[PDB]
Amino acid sequence: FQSMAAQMSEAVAEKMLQYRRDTAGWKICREGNGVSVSWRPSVEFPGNLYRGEGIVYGTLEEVWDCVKPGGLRVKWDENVTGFEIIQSITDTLCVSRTSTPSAAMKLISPRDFVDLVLVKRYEDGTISSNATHVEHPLCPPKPGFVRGFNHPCGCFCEPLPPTKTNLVTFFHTDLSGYLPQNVVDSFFPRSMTRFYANLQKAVKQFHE
């Protein structure tokens, strides 16, 4: 069990690592203050993979405390209402349920996601989160939520040589249910720029 729970999650981080390095495919959506988001076709499902990049003005373990899988995310992230750690497998590997609220003028009704999420730490100091969908018998479709499926996604928290942190995040989400494309195509870009906007505010609160 261990050897494969660990295994398919290791595959996830491997893909995430490749998403971080790749410079190809990526077509820019928008930019502006602090952030930059681009996208490309996912190979995991019909839809897209989204890439956020942005310097967060906080210590590396403050920014991580915010996005770490419960901790903090329920608070500051407008797109999260419920975070539950279901089956805590390893020190560093666990199965989580995430509840999103309504979005895009109630066109996107609440979804929930059941992820295998692995925290893995790199040699440079980078701490990362690596999440993929998994079916779990103790967390089936809930009444009034659509079951969404995240494909390999999460956060890279990268220390900078000074007192700041680089945050690169990938949203790889299948909203699923029954949604027109253009709805979905508008939401995600905006969802990422708002994510960073929020994350920043949360950080600032420790420096105040």
Numbering used by the authors: 2 to 70, 73 to 164, 167 to 213
Give passages from the manuscript.
Steroidogenic acute regulatory (StAR) protein related lipid transfer (START) domains are small globular modules that form a cavity where lipids and lipid hormones bind. The ∼210 residue globular START module is a curved β-sheet gripped by two α-helices. The concave face of the β-sheet and the C-terminal α-helix enclose a hydrophobic cavity that can accommodate lipid molecules. Here we present crystal structures of four human START domains, those of STARD1, STARD5, STARD13 and STARD14/ACOT11.
Following recombinant protein production in E. coli, well-diffracting crystals were obtained for the START domains of STARD1, STARD5, STARD13 and STARD14. Their crystal structures were solved and refined to between 2.0 and 3.4 Å resolution. All structures reported are relevant to disease. They are down- (STARD13) or up-regulated (STARD5) in cancers, mutations in them result in metabolic disorders (STARD1) or they are linked to obesity (STARD14;).
